[PDB]
C-alpha cells in the first residue's frame, strides 16, 4: 500500500529484499533481479533478505539460491513469521553467521511435493526426477546445517515444524534475534 | 482512494500505521516494513498502530508482533471498531500503558482455527502444531494481561466478546479512550 518510492522500494535502497509470499517464477525473477541490481550498485556491502513465505516452486527457489551463492556480497537472511519448505531452504542459504529468525518465527521443513500422470514409463520418469530433486535439496541442506543427509531425509519425511530456537540447534539459522 | 500523497501515506508521515483488514502475509509484510521504516527515521519517537481487524494468519500476526517487540520505539495500539483473534493479540502487544480502545470497540479472543486432511499420522502432526501454537499464544497473552495461563485457556475455549471496558479490566488494553 503506502508511499515515502513505495515502502518496498524504499527498503531496497537499504539493500533489503522482501521475500513475503509464495515462491513462484515471478517472485524469483524479481528477487534475482534485486540481488543482481544490488551487487552492481556495490559488490561489498551486505544484502538483507527478509523471509516470510510458505515456500513454493523448487526450481524458482533454486534460481534464488544460485543467485545468492554467485554474487560477492554476503546475503543475510532473516525469518519473520514463517519460513516453510523452499522458504526454509533459502533461510538456510544465507551467509554463514548471518542467518536469523525472530523469536516467534516458525520454520518448517519437509520433502518436495509433486505429481505425475500417464503411462508407467512417464510416471517412472517423473518419479526419478522428484527423487533426484529431493537428493539435491538434501545434500545442500546437509552442507548448510552440518546435519547428515540421512538425518535430513528422516526429519523431512513429514512436515516438521521448528521453533526459532530449534532451527538454531538444527543449524538452519545461526542466531535468534532477541529484542 | 482519496488524496491530500494519499491519506494513509500522509498519516504514515505522522508515525501512524493503519491495520484495517484481515491479517495475511501481504498485510504483515507491509506493516513490518512500515515499522522498520519508522524506526530508521527516528528510533525514539512513538509509533501509533491503529487496529480495525477481524484477525487472520497467526504466523503473519507474529511477524508483526516480533517486529513490534524488536524495534526501539514504543508502539501504541488503538482499537477502533474491532480487534478479534490475532487482531486482539496485536492490540495487547502494544507498549504497556499505551494500549487503547475507543468506547464502542469490540475485542474478541478465542482459540486458533485450522484444518487437516490425510493419514492418521498427518492429522497428528497438524494437531500437535496447532496445540503448540495455542500454548505459545496463551503464554504470551498471560504475560501481557497479567492473567494466568489457566484463565486464558478457559476464556479462549470459545469465542469470548469483550467491551472496551471489559478488555481494560481483563488486561488487554490500559485505557478506554474517552471523547
Amino acid at each position: 500500500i503506502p508511499t515515502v518510492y513505495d515502502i518496498y522500494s524504499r527498503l531496497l535502497k537499504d539493500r533489503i529484499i522482501m521475500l513475503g509470499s509464495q515462491i513462484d517464477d515471478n517472485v524469483a525473477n524479481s528477487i534475482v533481479s534485486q540481488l543482481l541490481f544490488l551487487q552492481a550498485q556495490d559488490s561489498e556491502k551486505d544484502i538483507y533478505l527478509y523471509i516470510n513465505s510458505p515456500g513454493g516452486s523448487v526450481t524458482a527457489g533454486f534460481a534464488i539460491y544460485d543467485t545468492i551463492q554467485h554474487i560477492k556480497p554476503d546475503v543475510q537472511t532473516i525469518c519473520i513469521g514463517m519460513a516453510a519448505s523452499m522458504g526454509s531452504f533459502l533461510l538456510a542459504a544465507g551467509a554463514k553467521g548471518k542467518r536469523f529468525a525472530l523469536p516467534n518465527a516458525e520454520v518448517m521443513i519437509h520433502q518436495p511435493l509433486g505429481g505425475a500422470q500417464g503411462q508407467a514409463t512417464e510416471i517412472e520418469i517423473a518419479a526419478n526426477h522428484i527423487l533426484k530433486t529431493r537428493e539435491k535439496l538434501n545434500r545442500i541442506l546437509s552442507e548448510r546445517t552440518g546435519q547428515s543427509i540421512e538425518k535430513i531425509q528422516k526429519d523431512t519425511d513429514r512436515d516438521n515444524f521448528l521453533t526459532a530456537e530449534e532451527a538454531k540447534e538444527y543449524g538452519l539459522i545461526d542466531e535468534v534475534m532477541v529484542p | 482512494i482519496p488524496t491530500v500523497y494519499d491519506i494513509y501515506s500522509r498519516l504514515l508521515k505522522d508515525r501512524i500505521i493503519m491495520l484495517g483488514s484481515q491479517i495475511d502475509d501481504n498485510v504483515a509484510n507491509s506493516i513490518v516494513s512500515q515499522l522498520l521504516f519508522l524506526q530508521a527515521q527516528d528510533s525514539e519517537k512513538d509509533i501509533y498502530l491503529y487496529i480495525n481487524s477481524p484477525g487472520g494468519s497467526v504466523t503473519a500476526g507474529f511477524a508483526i508482533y516480533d517486529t513490534i517487540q524488536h524495534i526501539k520505539p514504543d508502539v501504541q495500539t488503538i482499537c477502533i471498531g474491532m480487534a478479534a483473534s490475532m487482531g486482539s493479540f496485536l492490540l495487547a502487544a502494544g507498549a504497556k500503558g499505551k494500549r487503547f480502545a475507543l468506547p464502542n470497540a469490540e475485542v474478541m479472543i478465542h482459540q486458533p482455527l485450522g484444518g487437516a486432511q490425510g493419514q492418521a499420522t498427518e492429522i497428528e502432526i497438524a494437531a500437535n502444531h496447532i496445540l503448540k501454537t495455542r500454548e505459545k499464544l496463551n503464554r504470551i497473552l498471560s504475560e501481557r494481561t497479567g492473567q494466568s495461563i489457566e484463565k486464558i485457556q478457559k476464556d479462549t475455549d470459545r469465542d469470548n466478546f469483550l467491551t472496551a471496558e471489559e478488555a481494560k479490566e481483563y488486561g488487554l488494553i490500559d485505557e478506554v479512550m474517552v471523547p
Binding site: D14, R15, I16, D46, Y50, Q76, K98, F100 | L36, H70
Partner: peptide
C-alpha cells in the same frame, strides 16, 4: 532490523 541486519 538493525543492529545487525542492517
Amino acid at each position: 532490523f538493525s543492529p545487525x541486519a542492517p
